[PDB]
Amino acid sequence: ELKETPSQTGGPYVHIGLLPKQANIEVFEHNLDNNLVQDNTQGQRIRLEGQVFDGLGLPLRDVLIEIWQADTNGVYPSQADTQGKQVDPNFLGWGRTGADFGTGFWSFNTIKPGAVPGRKGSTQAPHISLIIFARGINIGLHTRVYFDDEAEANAKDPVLNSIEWATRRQTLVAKREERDGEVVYRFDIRIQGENETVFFDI
């Protein structure tokens, strides 16, 4: 048996290798990005945005974020999904973005995911899996984004219910807002301190 290769921080320039356009490097013809909606993609379009804060309450302006999610019917565009259901064929389910160097805001254009089977016959509430990389972070931090308009499903969600300090479950619920026809979910992440966001070892 082998031991996993150890993690090391992404460092301050994680953009060169992961978002070359943000670093103004044009080497690739196809670039990976924060837009998961293709023209024929099914579901309700939503915009997910927020900021990541350090222990002084200051936003990280060098953070890199990725999300992984199911399609509108809660099927993952992955060979490991064993549901036997057909997934939306115009959906990658993943995206990547970095925070603006000045303001610290980050965002994704995606679709609100459908509910996915939980373990042993349970049903999970709609959620987006999110990971954070940055200088100072030795191992990417995993979290989840749930939706405040899904109170009923959230209450029965297996993962939220496995967090014994109930007061912290709320750090994982994004707030719905309706900006000019666009349904936006605001999700701020607090790495340390009060209202520190729950992080998972998955």
Partner 1 sequence: IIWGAYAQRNTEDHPPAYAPGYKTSVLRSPKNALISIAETLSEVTAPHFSADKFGPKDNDLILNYAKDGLPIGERVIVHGYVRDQFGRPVKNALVEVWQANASGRYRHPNDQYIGAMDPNFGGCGRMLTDDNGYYVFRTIKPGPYPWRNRINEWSPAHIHFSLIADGWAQRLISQFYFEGDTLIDSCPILKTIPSEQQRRALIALEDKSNFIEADSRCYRFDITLRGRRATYFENDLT
Of 76 and 180, which CB lies nearer to partner 1 in the complex structure? 76
Cα–Cα nearest to 142, from 197, 188, 97: 197
* Total binding residues toward partner 1, as defined by CB under 8 A: 80
Q: Which residue in the set 7, 13, 78, 103 belongs to the binding site for ligand [O-] (CB under 6 A)?
A: 13
Span interacting with partner 1, options 103-111, 117-125, 146-154, 178-186, rule CB under 8 A: 117-125
Flag whether 135 is marked binding.
Answer: yes
| Strand, helix or coil for residue 111 | strand
Report, in Å, the least distance between residue 131 CB and partner 1: 6
Query: Residues in the site for a copy of itself, rule: CB under 8 A?
Result: 56, 58, 165, 167-168
Residues from 93 through 112 that contact partner 1 (CB under 8 A): 93-94, 101
Residue 11 Cβ vs Fe ion, minimum distance, rounded to whole Å? 5
| CB 151, CB 176: distance < 8 Å | no
Cβ of 137: how many Cβ atoms within 10 Å? 19
CA-nearest of 99, 96, 127 to 109 is 96
Pick one of 11, 20, 114, 118: the residue that binds Fe ion (CB under 5 A): 11
Under the binding rule (CB under 8 A), the answer on residue 124 touching partner 1 is yes
Q: Which does 194 bind (CB under 5 to 8 A by kind): Fe ion, partner 1, ligand [O-], none?
A: none
The structure tokens 């992955």 sit at 78
The whole-angstrom separation of Cα 66 and Cα 63 is 10
Q: Distance between CA atoms of 32 and 29, rounded to whole angstroms?
A: 10
Binding residue positions: 135
Residues that bind ligand [O-] (CB under 6 A): 11-13
